[PDB]
Design an enzyme around this catalytic site. Sequence first.
Site, mmCIF file in Angstrom:
data_model
loop_
_atom_site.group_PDB
_atom_site.id
_atom_site.type_symbol
_atom_site.label_atom_id
_atom_site.label_comp_id
_atom_site.label_asym_id
_atom_site.label_seq_id
_atom_site.Cartn_x
_atom_site.Cartn_y
_atom_site.Cartn_z
ATOM 1 N N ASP D 171 0.810 -1.177 0.000
ATOM 2 C CA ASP D 171 0.000 0.000 0.000
ATOM 3 C C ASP D 171 0.870 1.264 0.000
ATOM 4 O OD1 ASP D 171 -2.544 1.275 -0.142
ATOM 5 O OD2 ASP D 171 -2.893 1.089 1.906
ATOM 6 N N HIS D 254 -4.594 3.151 -7.004
ATOM 7 C CA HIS D 254 -5.761 2.879 -6.202
ATOM 8 C C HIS D 254 -7.059 2.714 -7.032
ATOM 9 C CE1 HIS D 254 -3.510 3.092 -2.452
ATOM 10 N NE2 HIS D 254 -4.603 2.663 -1.821
ATOM 11 N N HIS D 257 -6.689 -0.820 -8.283
ATOM 12 C CA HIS D 257 -7.123 -1.628 -7.151
ATOM 13 C C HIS D 257 -8.652 -1.758 -7.029
ATOM 14 C CE1 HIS D 257 -8.978 -1.759 -3.147
ATOM 15 N NE2 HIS D 257 -8.116 -2.721 -2.862
ATOM 16 N N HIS D 271 -5.622 -5.814 0.528
ATOM 17 C CA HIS D 271 -5.628 -4.498 -0.157
ATOM 18 C C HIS D 271 -4.245 -4.126 -0.691
ATOM 19 C CE1 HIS D 271 -6.682 -0.293 -0.730
ATOM 20 N NE2 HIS D 271 -5.617 0.029 -0.052
HETATM 21 NA NA NA Z 1 -0.964 4.614 -0.520
HETATM 22 ZN ZN LIG Z 2 -4.470 1.855 -0.057
#
Ligand code: NA
Ligand SMILES: [Zn+2]
Lengths: 367, 367, 367, 367
Positions: D171, D254, D257, D271
């Site tokens: 992340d 993101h 994602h 995640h």
């Molecule tokens: Na980030």
């Molecule tokens: Zn994230």
Amino acid sequence: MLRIIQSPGKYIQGANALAAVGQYAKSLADHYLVIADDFVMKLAGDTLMGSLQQHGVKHHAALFNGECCHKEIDRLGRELKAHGCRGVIGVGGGKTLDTAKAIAHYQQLPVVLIPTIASTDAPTSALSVIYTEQGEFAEYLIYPRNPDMVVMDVAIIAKAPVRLLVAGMGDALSTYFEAQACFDAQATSMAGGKSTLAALSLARLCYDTLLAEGVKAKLAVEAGVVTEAVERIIEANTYLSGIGFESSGLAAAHAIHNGFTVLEECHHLYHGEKVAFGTLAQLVLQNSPMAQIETVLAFCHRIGLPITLAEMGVSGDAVEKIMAVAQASCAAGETIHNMPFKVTPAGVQAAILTADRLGSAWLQQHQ
Amino acid sequence: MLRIIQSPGKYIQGANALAAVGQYAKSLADHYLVIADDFVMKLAGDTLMGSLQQHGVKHHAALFNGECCHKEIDRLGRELKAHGCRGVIGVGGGKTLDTAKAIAHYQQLPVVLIPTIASTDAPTSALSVIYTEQGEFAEYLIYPRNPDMVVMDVAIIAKAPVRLLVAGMGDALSTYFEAQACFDAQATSMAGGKSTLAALSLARLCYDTLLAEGVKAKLAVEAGVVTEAVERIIEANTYLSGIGFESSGLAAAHAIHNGFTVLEECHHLYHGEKVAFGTLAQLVLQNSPMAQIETVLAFCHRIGLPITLAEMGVSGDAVEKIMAVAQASCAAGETIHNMPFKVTPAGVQAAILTADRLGSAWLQQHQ
Amino acid sequence: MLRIIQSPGKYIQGANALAAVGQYAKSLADHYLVIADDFVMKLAGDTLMGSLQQHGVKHHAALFNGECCHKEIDRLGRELKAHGCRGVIGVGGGKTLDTAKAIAHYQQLPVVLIPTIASTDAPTSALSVIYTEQGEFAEYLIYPRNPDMVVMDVAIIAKAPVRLLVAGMGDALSTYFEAQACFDAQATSMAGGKSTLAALSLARLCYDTLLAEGVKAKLAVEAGVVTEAVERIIEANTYLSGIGFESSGLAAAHAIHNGFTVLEECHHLYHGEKVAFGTLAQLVLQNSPMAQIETVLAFCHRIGLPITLAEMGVSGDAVEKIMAVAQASCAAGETIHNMPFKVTPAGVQAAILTADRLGSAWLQQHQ
Amino acid sequence: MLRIIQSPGKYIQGANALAAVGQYAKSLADHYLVIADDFVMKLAGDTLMGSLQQHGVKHHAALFNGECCHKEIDRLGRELKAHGCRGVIGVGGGKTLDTAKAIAHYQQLPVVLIPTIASTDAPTSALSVIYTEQGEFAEYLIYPRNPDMVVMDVAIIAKAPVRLLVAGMGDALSTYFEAQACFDAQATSMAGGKSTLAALSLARLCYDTLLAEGVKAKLAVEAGVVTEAVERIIEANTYLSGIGFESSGLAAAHAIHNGFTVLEECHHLYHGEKVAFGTLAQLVLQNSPMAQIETVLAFCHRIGLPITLAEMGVSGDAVEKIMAVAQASCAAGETIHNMPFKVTPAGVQAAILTADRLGSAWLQQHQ
Ligand code: NA
Ligand SMILES: [Zn+2]
Ligand code: NA
Ligand code: NA
Ligand code: NA
Ligand SMILES: [Zn+2]
Ligand SMILES: [Zn+2]
Ligand SMILES: [Zn+2]
Ligand SMILES: [Zn+2]
Ligand SMILES: [Zn+2]
Ligand SMILES: [Zn+2]
Ligand SMILES: [Zn+2]
């Protein structure tokens, strides 16, 4: 003391079998409820309804709502009764098939199953596996008869993602080892007796077909096509494994699979991926020689099945988590007691933790 | 001319055996001195005293002062006499066990040995190895009978550092080669006769178990757990090797081990580590074929046993030091004269220096 | 606040220096007690006594009984007084040298040290390290002055086993890192003040010489010969490291070395082998960048110094043993508090366990 | 046009911080609802309540029912009102923390978050991510203020499975690339303005810390311990990444994602695992040079993040599935329009399919 083998009435396989389903279905009934989700209807619906029409078989499509639950089952039951259908066709994945078995059971009608993937050995069996909503193994639910007919369209299967074929080879992989363990223990199968020679031999033939054909079939399906190797693996993942496990026996690998369902880290891996690792753990539990462990490690690594806890999503100090897996695998009534020796949670934990180490050392030598 | 085999009365092994020691000890005596150092008492004391109490066996703990010396032996003798004990229990490592054998010998009472590590084949034997204080082999000291009972708690052993299991596999590794050399020479064993078929076969079974199970067991013990492979290796390191060496025979490998005790560079490596290299040197001395040397080199390298002088701490121009090893290994009365051919210091030096070269070339190919 | 550097009066090095010792010793005294064990007298005695005779220096040989203990010290003191000697010569290994320093201290006479190995940086220092009889670090014992003269015969050193040269490079390896840590902390050295620029620079020069010359020197000594690379390493292991550590400072690596002396598994590895690993652990403790860790791992692996707990004999669940190492390294008065940040046992345990992991991963990539 | 940076009031980190939470919490309120599930209460409850008691802070524990839903939120709201609490403490994983933010928001009270894992950069942000029940991205839900205080107990985090630390690095990995893309586009952040220099620099510092410290930290956490490298990564995964993404900006990674959440094959990967791959795809979308792609591929492979579709569970003819990912990533309002160039579904599909190929070629060279 009694030896018993049971089987679906007829198992049919080959390229474009979907287009010939009407001749075979007609022999059981002239009017069917067709249970399929929307994706499957779009994929297979015109070919199937086409075949049925061409052989004078009447049909009402019913949209399956994804889950195999009493509600959906009772619902589809009522719908069937209202159009007067005299047979059920299930088409698609495991939850669709398990739903069609139940509908046919409660309505006492003949059932034709059409799997559109070959990722488990469920289709031929008089069985459904119930989980909780949290994904945790609940129970084997057993019907008193097998599906009448199972139809495997190999062209459809070879266009499905290769990962689903691999997962079916993973499920098939356990079949010989569990069957031979049961046979050795003189354990009772889900068919209700001791294993026949027939069911054990089919289970061995499963293992031997995977070793001969598994890589060749994987390569063909990666190209989207059907070769003879693919035809053999589909038989192995479906008929050989299905008779082997139901009429010959389950043992440690499937109990260990069930035990892994108490961990969230795994809960989305496919059934056969987990069963492959559970097979490895069974090898350590029964002390298979190193040459046999090597053979299995090389097979799983070569087709893409997990051989370590990390490939199942489990890391860190998993001592306690694997003890939880081990306790659950040893619950009363689990199949691990079909092993030809006494099994305890501590022994299962040992086998799991050790299997992980074997597979990690194998990965470090790469081969 | 006479064939003789001797043995402990009973050898007992398995997970959590410590908790069952009272049934077995009760059969020999109802009152024991328990000899254990403090670390071992903290580890095993509550389980053991618990077991003994539960079977109506009386017990006085005595703190062992680490060393197997006449002083400690005479001391523990007096203590025994003063509480009226009718049996000795030794629990822990080699020096604790060798002390308990001596106490039981001098007091003429039954002895139960409970090794908490499986790093040598000493426990079952009617024997103790005396060194000098400088660490240099002194003598085999021989009792007229074997310990009554040897109890191996595999759960305890599998929690001990893996290096100690490996060292026991190193000691076990020599057993077949020394036994078969003696057998071939028609040499007399420490049991006092020619070898039985039984003692030779146990020695071979030792070698064969190490090759089948050694890596699998090492992996399990690295995870802290007991599998069947670990159970097999513990039997191999303890019972198979112990009967093999005492009743079948010692030869070059242990004499070479003894000879290495004159060098300071080695003096802290474990007995079985040195014996593994001494086994390699024995292979060169008797001209084993290359395939057999390869097998042993691959085994030692795969489990972590030394295959060169540098891994034993010896470097540089070691010509003179290895001649000193060789002279000491050939002293009058040493076991190297049990080889089926004449051995001289020059031949032993040759075998050592050459074994080092073999192992160094093997390391360069990595495999 | 004061910067202080101390030093032996004269440091002399080169091939066959032993044969020239008489000119230099004569300048301090015309009559010496020569302390050497028997092996060293046989090796070096005729050359040394020859040199002394040739320059009109009187000498009484005294046989050293191997250990540096008050008894041997008081004994050699009396002997000196009885022949009227006006100087002490120590020849051989560390215990012989430490004994000669003490004899010269108590008798208040000049001392010439002749190390026959270059395996530690002790010789130049106003220091002796006291252990227990069980091998466990006791205390730094500090004299009020440095040895008058240190003579390094490089021809003798290059005929000693390569493992002893490597161990000296291991000890030397820590010098820069400990000195720079102390310098950064503004810590007080054993010379009694803050570090000079001179002592820090010699310490850095130590590290830089090891990296440039260490492999080349190792190769030469494996052949038994002296090249310029060997001359540089001997200076680095002896003078550079000796001034660096005494006048610049000790810190985590030597405290961690001391802490490892509570484990039996290590107790026979050479001081510099353990200090090398302690240096690695210091790198993790102070968070050195990965490139610097890589450089050190590649150096230690290339010359044969340990980079994992297993190469120090430690295996299994060493969590508790490393916590014991860590507590001992953090004792009051230990040098680890010279780090430029607060250190706790938990941090030291972390650095050790992590260093082991770094070195094990490095071994798996082989390079 | 306005530059805006927002932040939690105070971020506190270090080993055993949980035991010091009472001093810091006291400064905001003297009475707290503590929201934690049962596993977390068993792990952390006695230390936390202990700390609170010791500083005169009153507390009512409330059992969290696992899910962040309006029902649970409204429920916990009522409970708070009934005991009169003047503050909320959230302890544990993301759903527990997101629930505590909402409770504190609706009750308008101060909130202290105590993450027990460092697997996402959510904790510091004025944000919650809402999914559907089927696991499909729903919306960013934005609060008008940041949590008052975030407390990271590094000892607790380093005992959590290494896979969760890796996912947090995954992340964190996207942070620099998304922030710099937004900065270049002059895009508006979730803080409501253009990025400050501060937020961009923290984002870059995130990337640079991951590259310097990520492997070292992973190794330490695999050993269960805290080193300085672990402290740095936890800051990077939490504070640096959290400010970087909220106050500097989200972009393609993101959005990609989010797009992957329409596929079932991925739905259980963490995640940060998915975001790592989405970062790779962003690199292809913006045409990063090969050296930068190599750096990221080597980082992800070295710590265990996915670099191919197959490692995300996706196989076969995924042309249509990736077009679905691509359409969803480009929905109106998604962050991918923050890229400094026009992005279309076809471009996103291209970047994904190509990233897979890059990572597969990298795997074939192994390095
Ligand atoms: Na980030
Ligand atoms: Zn994230
Ligand atoms: Na099966
Ligand atoms: Na033996
Ligand atoms: Na030093
Ligand atoms: Zn109908
Ligand atoms: Zn299955
Ligand atoms: Zn007694
Ligand atoms: Zn032995
Ligand atoms: Zn004199
Ligand atoms: Zn030193
Ligand atoms: Zn309250």
